[PDB]
Amino acid sequence: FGREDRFLNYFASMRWFGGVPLISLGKETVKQPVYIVDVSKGIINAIKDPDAKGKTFAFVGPNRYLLFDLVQYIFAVAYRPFLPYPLPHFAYRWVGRLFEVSPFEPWTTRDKVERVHMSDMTLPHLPGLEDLGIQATPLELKAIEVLRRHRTVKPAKTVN
Amino acid sequence: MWFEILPGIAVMAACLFIPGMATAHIHKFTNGGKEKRVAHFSYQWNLMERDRRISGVNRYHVTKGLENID
Amino acid sequence: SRGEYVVAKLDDLVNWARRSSLWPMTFGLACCAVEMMHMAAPRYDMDRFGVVFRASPRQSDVMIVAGTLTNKMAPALRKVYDQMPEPRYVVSMGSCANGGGYYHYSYSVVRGCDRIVPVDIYVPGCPPTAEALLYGILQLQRKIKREKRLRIWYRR
Amino acid sequence: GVLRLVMELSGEMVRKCDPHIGLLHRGTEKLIEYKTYLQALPYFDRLDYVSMMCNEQAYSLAVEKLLNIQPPPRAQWIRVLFGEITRLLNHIMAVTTHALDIGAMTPFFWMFEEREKMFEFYERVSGARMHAAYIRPGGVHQDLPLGLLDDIYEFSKNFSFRIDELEEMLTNNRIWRNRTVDIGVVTAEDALNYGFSGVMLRGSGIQWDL
Amino acid sequence: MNIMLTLLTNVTLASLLVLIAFWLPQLNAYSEKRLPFSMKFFLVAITFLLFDLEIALLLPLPWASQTNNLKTMLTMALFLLILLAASLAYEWTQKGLEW
Amino acid sequence: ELVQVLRRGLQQVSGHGGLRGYLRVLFRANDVRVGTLVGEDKYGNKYYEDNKQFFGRHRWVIYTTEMNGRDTFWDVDGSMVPPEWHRWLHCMTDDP
Amino acid sequence: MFMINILSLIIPILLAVAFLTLVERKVLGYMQLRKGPNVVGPYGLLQPIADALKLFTKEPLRPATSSISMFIIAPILALSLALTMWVPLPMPYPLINMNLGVLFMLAMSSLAVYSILWSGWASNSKYALIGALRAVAQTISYEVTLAIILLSVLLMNGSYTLSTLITTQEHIWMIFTSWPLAMMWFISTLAETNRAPFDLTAGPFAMFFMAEYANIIMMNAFTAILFLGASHDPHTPELYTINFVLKTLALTITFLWIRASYPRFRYDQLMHLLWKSFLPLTLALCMWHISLPIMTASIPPQS
Amino acid sequence: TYKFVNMREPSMDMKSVTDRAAQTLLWTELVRGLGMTLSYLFREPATINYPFEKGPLSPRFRGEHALRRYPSGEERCIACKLCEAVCPAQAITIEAEPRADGSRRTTRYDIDMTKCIYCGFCQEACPVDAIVEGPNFEFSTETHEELLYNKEKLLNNGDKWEAEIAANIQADYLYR
């Protein structure tokens, strides 16, 4: 997630369709957002780090969130009224397919809706971002930076 | 020189020629080759309505001549 | 096929439209601006090329940096660049704007306007002559002519 | 040029006017301390880039006074001639830009044609249109080309008509008079105290010309 | 009917051409990145409103000239214009037209 | 009078090789003046002069349509002039 | 065939406006010892087309905080009013023959200020709001004297019908009967359209620009109809159309000339100009033109 | 001696007052300005047809830099570094060593076009006229890097412009 990131921006963009549709009201999906600067610094340090030749890293954020309250926080920062209505998984797929038609880059795709709904895995065995000497930045510090432009406090609860 | 301004001006003139002329031609084509009848004051409107009824083709422009007096 | 032909023709039309009317906003920072105003003078007549005289930033197409960029002025120039509609270009005029020039080793001078904004055309000289600036503007026109957006979108 | 101006207005009236400068501070005076005198000469072209050879002349006079030498008479006559040409250039710039800001905008072109001719004179004498660096602290760099005085005479016998056209456009116009008359009135004592010079003094009746 | 059709056509053409102008550059992808309350400006609007009312009163003059009572209508029209001039003069002398 | 200016216009049309050449020069150089041929360039540039024009317009160049490797029917520029004709064209000398 | 008539009225005005810009640049350039656009097209003839295409292909900068409703509505109103005010005009025959054509045009011109007000208030800026307020005040101020001068002139016509103006001026122009009113009317039309010396203030910007230029052309055409009467022969209206177009072109070129010839007023200076030089003279001449037909037994017929 | 610019007193007789009132009411000076502009329209413009026509120049004109060579074909530069010393903007960088035949020649001769002020001090400081500032001015560039000249670029410029450069030096060397 970042300033020119789709994920923070993608949720904010929907407000246009009035309501926000989340499969199972977003109650069965957990996410692990990571800051863009953190990933770039991790890549730089991995370039610098000599023993990270054949290793595999997992860059994750500090806090896990349910989809519903994450979208709620995104809409709260943007000062946009938030209405969430459950949508059938098959119904959601249909909308994505309709969207997929455009010559121009699509707002959403079937793979994207399915991908967003899925909860982020957890791989504690893989070396993480902290092994590269970087402290992951919480989304609460950069939410205002990303979402100030979407306008014209109460951080979301995390699960660990 | 200054006459190089004349082309664009000419275009404007042509663009300003089209509306008025067009109206006149349409007024000649819709009103049977004559000037469109103006109707203020509600008396000219009565004259037009009387003309429409007399012709029998439901058109004010068609004119019934003396030949229709028997 | 016809799919490439139609996008090629439309791309040519769009490029001709964009390069046949370039509306510049000019930062008259220093002495380079005086030659700028001589390119609008009757002898050279920038307006006869479709290049309008002193366009507003809200509807400008090309940014001409004419003069020294100090540290105190750089944020304002960056903001003005950020306030431009997307099909925008920057022309760096003169040696001070190109690389700091005759105040390169100064404590209060940006060593080239390209540290702040990307630059499309560099016009050399101190100041560059009116004809030299006209040559640069014409060159920018050819560069715009060479670009191709619909083709890239088609092959992508 | 480039100016930031912070002002407080009570309704239409300007209660206070504050200019913030330094947007073109390049540190010329500190850079001069790292050059020789000849190397430091071209900075004065850049100081007042509407009147170049006048700055050249001032710097050359200072260096000559410190050196206890004097230029040859022909150099001095050339200096005064090109200083008067520079004065014509600067006054054209000033008047036409004043009118342009107010809104006339036609004499700007009318007189920048003559300004282009005077840059042709500069280029013929020095090889540079506006930053010649011709006046050196020992005289001038090069002698005039053999056909320059004739062209200067030909130019200068036609300029009075251009000034007359400018006056036709400006001097008797009621809009221009209403824009300029009784605006920015300064008293002679205030002008002398505040450090004014040139026209800003002579507009208040002070009889002073260096 | 004809006036309604003409107004509808003008509005429709303006709306369509504004929409195409506003949507043609939105198909291609880009970066996609107080109090003072001056009092004289209110007096200008109020004076305009009052003079517009008096103009509304003056409007039936072209038909007023065929009444057979020409002396009375001339007297009343001149009276209305005199009071309009008097309103202007009163607002002038009370420093109501200053800046 | 007016007949004479029309005659000079017709002479300009006839002096460019007909209507085809007239349209060619009008759309390539935005000018239809005719002058004495001063010289021909080894790259295809033609140089004309007319001393009756005011200073600045008394010399001009008609560019070639194909220089070293590119099509130059439309994309002409001032860097295509060789140094000798560059000196002549910029009035740095009176001798071609 | 009323749709065809509407389209044949509405399209040539827009083309005329596009070409007017070329003429304005070209006329000004030759007045400044230079040329206008003469590279894009044989004589700059392709310059308006390139300008239109570039402006229509350039990104629109929506303020990201403004009321999109009024932001869209204002150009719609501007274009609609500008195109509507051409309907009443008779060249020689009007598209719509109104009894109160002049009054209808007055009402439309009165509406014209809502676009300025909405554009200023939707701009989401204090300074643009102040500028819009100044423009609206100037517009209402000068439309007052426009209305008074217009009724004073129509007192010799006998009605508000625009066609009757052709019958009134069959022998002599109206400029000779009352030139001072024509002078003040010309200045008031200059000040209404925010034209020099009164010019104190991608897609929607072009929309407003075409609206303003169409208003300029329409104002000049109305002035030519009102004060420079062309002789109309019923069996060949093309002569009247040619004369009317020539006079309108001359008046528009006169606006360009005045723009090229003068400096600009201050705001308070034009306020003082109107309220202390035009209004008293306008009222005095209105009294004079009321009393004049009665003194001379020269009252126009229609009632 | 001094003159008064605005020390006139308008006459107060009836004819003068009537003349001023006629000026105020009929806008006579505005018509005079209009007439000046109208007359000025009907005269030939001063615009030249660039790039097909070019502005006048002089043999002294300072343009793009070039390194010259002798008629035999050896370069005139002897690595004296006087141009580098005199350069007011420090735009010249020079490195030299003895050539394989023992000649005194440069191995590096760079001029930064973006630090150059085009003053011409370098060409007048040169003892052997190795470096000159030629007549070319139409060398605008799309990147900052191509405006950083090395010895090869300057030698190529000299070989490219030598004819015109030599002609200009022949025309102007008797003034130097």
Ligand SMILES: CCCCCCCCCCCCCCCCC[C@@H](O)O[C@H](CO[C@H](O)CCCCCCCCCCCCCCC)COP(=O)(O)OCC[N+](C)(C)C
């Ligand atoms: C009625 C329906 C309208 C729909 C929308 C379209 C709007 C109107 C379209 C008409 C626009 C006219 C375009 C004509 C431009 C060509 C100009 C020509 O002169 O350019 C030459 C050729 O250059 C380019 O190659 C021209 C390419 C232009 C496009 C070619 C065909 C495009 C037509 C497709 C239109 C279909 C629209 C479909 C969507 C509705 C070279 O000029 P240039 O180099 O600059 O200047 C050099 C300056 N010199 C000579 C002094 C040195």
Ligand SMILES: CCCCCCCC/C=C\CCCCCCCC(=O)O[C@H](COC(=O)CCCCCCC/C=C/CCCCCCCC)COP(=O)(O)OCCN
């Ligand atoms: C015997 C029976 C006759 C009855 C009596 C009738 C006699 C009429 C005598 C008087 C008529 C003259 C009235 C004309 C309007 C005069 C208004 C006026 O003079 O106001 C000016 C203002 O005038 C202007 O400044 C306007 C200039 C705006 C620029 C426009 C350029 C002018 C040239 C354009 C050409 C005009 C074309 C007119 C005809 C148009 C045809 C449609 C005063 O301002 P200041 O001089 O600054 O002084 C005020 C401080 N005390």
Ligand code: SF4
């Ligand atoms: S680049 Fe040269 S001419 Fe331009 S402002 Fe700097 S010193 Fe002056």
Ligand code: SF4
């Ligand atoms: S012209 Fe002047 S600034 Fe440029 S390299 Fe030569 S000495 Fe240095």
Ligand code: SF4
């Ligand atoms: S002054 Fe001349 S010879 Fe000496 S180093 Fe410079 S270019 Fe070479």
